Design a protein around this ligand. Structure first.
Ligand SMILES: [Mg+2]
Ligand SMILES: [Mg+2]
Ligand SMILES: [Mg+2]
Ligand SMILES: [Mg+2]
Ligand SMILES: [Mg+2]
Ligand SMILES: [Mg+2]
Ligand SMILES: [Mg+2]
Ligand SMILES: [Mg+2]
Ligand SMILES: [Mg+2]
Length: 205
RNA sequence: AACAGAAUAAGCACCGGCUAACUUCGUGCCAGCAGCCGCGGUAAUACGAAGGGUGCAAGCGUUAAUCGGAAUUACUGGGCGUAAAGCGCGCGUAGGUGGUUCAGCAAGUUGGAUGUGAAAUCCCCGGGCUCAACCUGGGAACUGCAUCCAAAACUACUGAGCUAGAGUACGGUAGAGGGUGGUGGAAUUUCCUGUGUAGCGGUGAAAUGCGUAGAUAUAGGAAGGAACACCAGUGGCGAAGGCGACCACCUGGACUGAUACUGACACUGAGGUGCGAAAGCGUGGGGAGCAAACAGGAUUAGAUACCCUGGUAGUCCACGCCGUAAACGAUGUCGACUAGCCGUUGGGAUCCUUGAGAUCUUAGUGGCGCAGCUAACGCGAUAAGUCGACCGCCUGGGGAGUACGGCCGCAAGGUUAAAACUCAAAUGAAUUGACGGGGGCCCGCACAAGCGGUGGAGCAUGUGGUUUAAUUCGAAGCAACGCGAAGAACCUUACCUGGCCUUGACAUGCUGAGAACUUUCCAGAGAUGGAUUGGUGCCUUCGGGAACUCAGACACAGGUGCUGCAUGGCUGUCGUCAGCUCGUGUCGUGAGAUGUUGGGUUAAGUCCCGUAACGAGCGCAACCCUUGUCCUUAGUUACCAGCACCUCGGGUGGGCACUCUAAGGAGACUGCCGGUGACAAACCGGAGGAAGGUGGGGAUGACGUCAAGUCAUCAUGGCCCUUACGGCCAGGGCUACACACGUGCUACAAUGGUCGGUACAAAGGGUUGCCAAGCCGCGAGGUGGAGCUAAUCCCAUAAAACCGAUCGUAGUCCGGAUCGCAGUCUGCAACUCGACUGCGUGAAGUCGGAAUCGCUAGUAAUCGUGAAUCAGAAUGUCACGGUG
């Protein structure tokens, strides 16, 4: 059922989030670094929303480009968090670490940034649909050509597992030529676990 | 009037919907609640409490009892085609209603006057008690009944007329309208007679039956009984039931024309009177076929039934009875108005006349249709439309058209016709689905063609069952059982038996202690306990800090414990099936519907032509990968055509032709030819071409379904354990074992079996590894250490095929299970419990029931090779090639 919309297009649309060659004797000693970096960084940057954390390995050290749509929260008073983490990313990843920060201008057209706001609204006890009818039209005044948002879970009920489904525009999924974003962020309410899926469709080719 | 002092004085029901007003806590299909809907199975806004809140107040609630709401007994104010409801049809008494002109009358009717309709009560305007209830003055009202006066439209009564309703007299047609006799022809059966000789008859198929004691067939004859082909029709006639041979005989009514007469003589009809299909009943006839009851055969778990062979009352006639039917147009009779068109019976017209004529008009009988009505379906001059006159009948479902009583009947029975009790529903028309042993088109190894297996035997593997101290859980039709598990000697591992811990194996905070480290030691199955040379760091505001390790105490830690029906995540399934929806618009009272149907076509909701719909999305197609052709760029470790070289090995120099490798491109679009279609999609052929009509394969699975599976991968709501349901360590266990089922491998031999030679692959792994040459071993191997970080080195010898030999179809020079003995390898350790090797022994098995599965071409069938997991261990899983 609906094979993951990145794993079919690694190639014709998108590329990896981490590029580095490794021998067969060190391949599984760089993965375990790069997988507990991403669990570390998102638990620290719970605010100052983060979409993508890329990692390059040049000759013998590192490079990391953390993407936020609000860089001023992370770079606060000239890198009081930047040099503080750069001391302490080396303690998990023994090479010296670079940290680079870009902007995510138009923050309402990347799926991770959108779906983090859905968990925020649905844990403030906002209505399950008034939160989302406004979170699609706002992401259609500027930008995209199609948006699907599925909201599944407890949805407040007693024994209820309904799925909200609202769509606008055009979203293909069996065209490999197209360009689709995808993100699943969850939510822990005072009862039940709500999972949210987002399918922002940018332009094709 | 004075004194005292805020002192002397607030409950009751309810809070899920109707219905104003809400959340926590107990409880868990228990107790309990309730005016109806109905709540309660472990999170209850409905039960019990607690806060809060709403209604009313000196009262608030329940029960009982009437009228409202109830247009639910409908006078004002309902109904009867299908929801309950039109008698089976006539005739007719009492009664109800009355066409049209005058004239009279005044019984109804209207207007007025008088007498009355007790007072109170109700209503209106006032007046008294500090207000109000309460008391009270004046008026209206009491709808009525009676007596007088007047008016005269309508009804009644009376008197006279009129002909439009109704009836009579006269021509004239059409008819299965009745009753009483008579007479036919075809066919069936029984009987007689001739010829002739082996079956007839029956049915999914048979059997009972009938036959040489001469059947069926076939010809001749006789007797008898009932029905009346073709004409024959939405056709006729009758009050309805009903009525079909031809003729005579009596006999009723309808149509149509002309003309005179009577002058309202009419309509309906409670009671009462008649005619009442068929089955049945009584007495007498009559007995061809058909046929309940019955008998036998068959089918059948069973078959009184369907089907088969027989067969009686009855059906037929006369006379008498019974009175019901889906007695149907599910529609009482009678009268008047309201657009059309196409039929048909019979009858007059007019009309040019030859008509296969024309138009108009009545009496019937059919098909469509506008207004209109209808819940809808549907009726629509033969109303269910608009209106009149009289009658019958209906009041939720069962109980029940039933019981008692009455009247009729020879009998069966019929007609008239209740109640108690019990339920919150019974029923109507129309929608979307689902389903059919209903119909129409289409597709799939779905059948049919073909090859090969499963179930027979042996071993391998899983589940059920059994058993044990534990055989740790989970997955139960296809969708399950070589399944999580891509590896159980211990470890894994959860379970069992013990040994052993309590802030803990681990997290953070607190208090002390020492750097960490190294201790090379004993006890003990180990866990652990105690020795134990040593070590004394590290940054120093030199104060210490941080680092680690030990103890104390608190919050806690931890959980493979329950819930997959509290859920997220991730996968199966229908199904790679061709569908699934929306916007705006119009139709419908509404749930809906249309687009998305029709014709053609397609692997396809793919296209074309059509069309109250016009569009859009998801899907299909393409975009991606791989294989097949060629071109360009590229030449080491790959490559050898040309060149020498050679020791004859691309060995070497060399070459960039090639094969190969991998980058980037072209090629295929029904493009072109012909035919075919509406010439429009497309379809059938044809050329060229490496490839021809989506070239072959792969990934890609729509809206959804099954509360499908998983809390034991992980994440989480709740619930329990927290001196153990948590931790630690030994051995055991999951591999036990009369049995049954699932997949899988070998075999059962001569398209074979051995021995000796000899030929050709792809794909992949390897510096914590591959482990060569030499070397020693019957053999698995042991030495030995190269080469190697990979087109180089190693894994690494492909097997079937071919060639020669023997083997002669024998449970075997077949088959290899079992088992004895002897070895090597990994690992601390091969007892329960590993894999291989040697030697010996040699089983079942001679192609395998009912059944049942896979496959349409490099495919089935058969032969090998590699990888993942991995110290060791594949008949499985995944993957690549031979022969075909
Ligand atoms: Mg007081
Ligand atoms: Mg309560
Ligand atoms: Mg009433
Ligand atoms: Mg009458
Ligand atoms: Mg009075
Ligand atoms: Mg009838
Ligand atoms: Mg009737
Ligand atoms: Mg459809
Ligand atoms: Mg292995």
């Amino acid at each position: 059922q609906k094979v993951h919309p990145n794993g079919i297009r690694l190639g014709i649309v998108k590329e990896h989030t981490s590029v580095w060659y490794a021998d067969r004797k060190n391949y599984a000693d760089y993965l375990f670094a790069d997988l507990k970096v991403r669990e570390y960084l998102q638990d620290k940057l719970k605010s100052a929303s983060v979409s993508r954390i890329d990692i390059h390995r040049p000759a013998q050290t590192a490079r990391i480009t953390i993407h936020t749509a609000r860089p001023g929260i992370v770079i606060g008073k000239k890198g009081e968090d930047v040099e503080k983490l750069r001391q302490d990313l080396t303690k998990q990843m023994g090479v010296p670490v670079h940290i680079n920060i870009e902007e995510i201008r138009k923050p309402e057209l990347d799926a991770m940034l959108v779906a983090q706001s859905v968990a925020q609204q649905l844990e403030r006890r906002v209505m399950f649909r008034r939160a989302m009818k406004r979170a699609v039209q706002n992401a259609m005044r500027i930008g995209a050509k199609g948006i699907k948002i599925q909201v599944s879970g407890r949805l407040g009920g007693a024994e209820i597992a309904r799925t909200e489904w609202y769509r606008e525009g055009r979203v293909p999924l069996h065209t490999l030529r197209a360009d689709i974003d995808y993100a699943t962020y969850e939510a822990h309410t005072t009862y039940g676990v709500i999972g949210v899926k987002v399918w922002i469709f940018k332009g094709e080719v």
